[PDB]
């Protein structure tokens, strides 16, 4: 229904993952390779690896629900992206995602310590965790297609209301400080 | 024409007065516009002293 907008979304989502030789690769998995080859805080390293895999997870949710499925919007469809301003704006940025990762990396002077000699197994973990994240997130998202009755998991609850953060943060000290004020 | 007059009254005349500001006004004051020295390499001569910088000696043929 929205070819160019969907096309741009896939490009942007893939950049979030860091597909090789694309804009995402020239920064992100270079960091993950860099963070592996360092004296890090052990538990700090693991969380990023869980995080970068988690980057693909919500990325599927965007592509899965919004595009890959049957329509669910109100009946009167007003889908339209033919406006030149919309096309030109996305087009200008979209070429910046296909390129400018190679362009900047080559153009900038080489001035960082290069991690050249790593054992193979952690060299491409960024591709593993994303593909692993891609595979299971798709299966779990497609599990919604199954007619099975849903059971509200308490872990899902913790994630959905933002780690219970807003209702303690944005309710308790605000009340206490304002209560002390009056 | 709209683009041409735009360049004159938004690109030409602004950089004109900044150039005057950054060529005679501030430049008459020391240590107001300072840059890192042009990073030179052994090899190419320096324009002012006219002396080729002594190039390094042999590398131990560390070819792939």
């Amino acid at each position: 229904a929205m070819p160019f907008t969907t096309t741009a979304l896939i490009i942007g989502s893939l950049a979030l993952t860091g597909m090789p030789y694309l804009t995402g690769f020239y920064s992100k998995d270079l960091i993950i390779e860099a963070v592996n080859m360092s004296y890090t805080n052990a538990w700090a390293l693991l969380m990023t690896l869980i995080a970068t895999s988690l980057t693909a997870a919500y990325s599927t949710r965007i592509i899965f629900f919004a595009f890959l499925g049957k329509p669910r919007f109100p009946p009167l469809v007003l889908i339209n992206e033919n406006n030149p301003l919309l096309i030109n704006s996305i087009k200008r940025l979209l070429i910046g995602s296909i390129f400018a990762g190679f362009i900047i990396s080559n153009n900038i002077p080489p001035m960082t310590v290069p991690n050249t000699t790593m054992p193979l197994y952690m060299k491409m973990t960024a591709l593993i965790v994303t593909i692993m994240g891609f595979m299971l997130a798709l299966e779990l998202n497609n599990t919604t297609y199954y007619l099975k009755f849903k059971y509200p998991s308490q872990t899902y609850k913790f994630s959905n209301m933002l780690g219970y953060y807003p209702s303690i943060m944005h309710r308790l000290p605000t009340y206490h400080n304002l209560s002390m004020s009056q | 024409y709209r683009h041409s007059i735009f360049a004159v009254t938004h690109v030409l005349i602004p950089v004109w007065i900044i150039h005057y500001y950054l060529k005679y006004h501030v430049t008459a004051k020391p240590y107001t516009v300072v840059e890192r020295k042009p990073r030179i390499f052994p090899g190419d001569t320096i324009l002012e002293t006219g002396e080729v910088i002594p190039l390094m000696k042999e590398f131990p043929d560390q070819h792939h």
Binding site: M47, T48, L54, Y156 | -
Partner: protein, 60 residues
């Protein structure tokens, strides 16, 4: 949000450390806290990212 809260205003925080990077390396305790803070921030925001039902929240 597409301009400010995506790539041009929230960048200020990380950019500040980039300006003071030469003074960053001398200390060892604080720089560990930076990678420590980034680690928890990555998971918790991503952990709350997946289970959201609004397109704007997911990108945020």
């Amino acid at each position: 949000s597409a301009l400010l809260h995506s790539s041009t205003m929230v960048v200020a925080g990380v950019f500040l450390l980039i300006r003071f990077y030469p003074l960053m390396e001398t200390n060892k305790l604080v720089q560990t806290m930076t990678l420590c803070l980034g680690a928890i921030t990555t998971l918790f925001t991503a952990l709350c990212a997946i289970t959201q039902n609004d397109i704007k929240k997911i990108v945020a």
